[PDB]
From Swiss-Prot:
Subcellular location: Secreted; Membrane
Family statement drawn from the similarity comment of this UniProt entry: Belongs to the peptidase A1 family.
EC supergroup of this enzyme: hydrolase
Summary of subunit composition and partner proteins: Interacts with ATP6AP2.
Glycosylation sites: N5, N75
Reaction catalyzed: Cleavage of Leu-|-Xaa bond in angiotensinogen to generate angiotensin I
EC number(s) per entry: 3.4.23.15
Protein name, entry field: Renin
Task of the protein: Renin is a highly specific endopeptidase, whose only known function is to generate angiotensin I from angiotensinogen in the plasma, initiating a cascade of reactions that produce an elevation of blood pressure and increased sodium retention by the kidney.
Disulfide bonds: C51-C58, C214-C218, C256-C293
Length: 337
């Protein structure tokens, strides 16, 4: 590890409090893409010009064309990348990637198979995995490791601010630090269970008064690429019975008028209770007894070995500015502002 004196920031767009993405450039001259920065995965991919237009997702997204880039390096190894909400497939390529200040030579997936559900619902084009090399498909070096190798970042850390939803900043990633403008009070740290996954021990989940969930302890994936807080089908059907909420296809709803008096939900991480108020986890889009309001908490059964686990996504990170510390293998939380 070599440390320099560089901090680099990426500005994010917030779409409807569900999608947070920024821009990268790939190739010479730069081809620009909207990407989610996802601590829950370790690969880079964008849609490829070689994607058949029978994938409607490839008609509606920006496609990388290797034939327009003088800095492209062929590889051609096939790979498949499995996300919580769906799967993409394609092949490895190498090119120059620009993110914030920084230019890095990077191996990434050119995606040629991009299912319409869910990718026709994506405002973003692809993904930049901020996870560890241990979970990288094809054992490809992740972008942050490649950036650390350059020895220009002040610290072996990166940080996420996600805003609530023209003039407002949707969010901000800091590579090599934190922005004290977007948090207050002190960082509280939890150690990773292990290097290789941004996953920490959780000691309990309260609904108001009572620890009625994860009573014997459980896992929390701190997942910048997940919209919601997620638990297993079994944990969530309990949480949602206790909130008086009903299942739609994939999510849970409450009568809009009941939203504001739903109880506080607390997550016990390291020393502290991380408390969400109903305003933090209800899409309070109306106060009518005659409309339904979605909850920013749903069921996700993440397969072993990472899961079963909770995932703390944008619902959580909106309240708690999050620092991901590779040097000391830990996660810091502070109150966002
Ligand atoms: C693809 O990339 C990997 C990782 O560096 C390399 O070891 C492999 O030989 C490459 N294959 C081709 C065919 O260029």
């Amino acid at each position: 590890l070599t440390l320099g004196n560089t901090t680099s920031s990426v500005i994010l767009t917030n779409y409807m409090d569900t999608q947070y993405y920024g821009e990268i450039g790939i190739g010479t001259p730069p081809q620009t893409f909207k990407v989610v920065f996802d601590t829950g995965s370790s690969n880079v991919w964008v849609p490829s010009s070689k994607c058949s237009r029978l994938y409607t997702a490839c008609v509606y997204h920006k496609l990388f064309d290797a034939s327009d880039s003088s800095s492209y390096k062929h590889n051609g190894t096939e790979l498949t990348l499995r996300y919580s909400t769906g799967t993409v497939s394609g092949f490895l390529s190498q090119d120059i990637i620009t993110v914030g200040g920084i230019t890095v030579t990077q191996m990434f997936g050119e995606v040629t198979e991009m299912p319409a559900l869910p990718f026709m619902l994506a405002e973003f084009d692809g993904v930049v995995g901020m996870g560890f090399i241990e979970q990288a498909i094809g054992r490809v070096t992740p972008i942050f490791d490649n950036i650390i190798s350059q020895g220009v970042l002040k610290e072996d850390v990166f940080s996420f601010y996600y805003n609530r939803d023209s003039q407002s900043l949707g969010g901000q990633i800091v590579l090599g630090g934190s922005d004290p403008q977007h948090y207050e009070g002190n960082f509280h740290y939890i150690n990773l269970i292990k290097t290789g996954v941004w996953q920490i021990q959780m000691k309990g989940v309260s609904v108001g008064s009572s620890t009625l969930l994860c009573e014997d302890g459980c896992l929390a994936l701190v997942d910048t690429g997940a919209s919601y807080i997620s638990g297993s089908t079994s944990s969530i059907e309990k949480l949602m019975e206790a909130l008086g909420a009903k299942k739609r296809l994939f999510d849970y709803v409450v009568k809009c008028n009941e939203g504001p008096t739903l109880p506080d939900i607390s997550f016990h991480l390291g020393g502290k209770e991380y408390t969400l108020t109903s305003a933090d986890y209800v899409f309070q889009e109306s106060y009518s007894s005659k409309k339904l309001c979605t909850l920013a908490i749903h069921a996700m059964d993440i397969p072993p070995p990472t899961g079963p686990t909770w995932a703390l996504g944008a619902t959580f990170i909106r309240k708690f500015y999050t620092e991901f510390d590779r040097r000391n293998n830990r996660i810091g939380f502070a109150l966002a502002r």
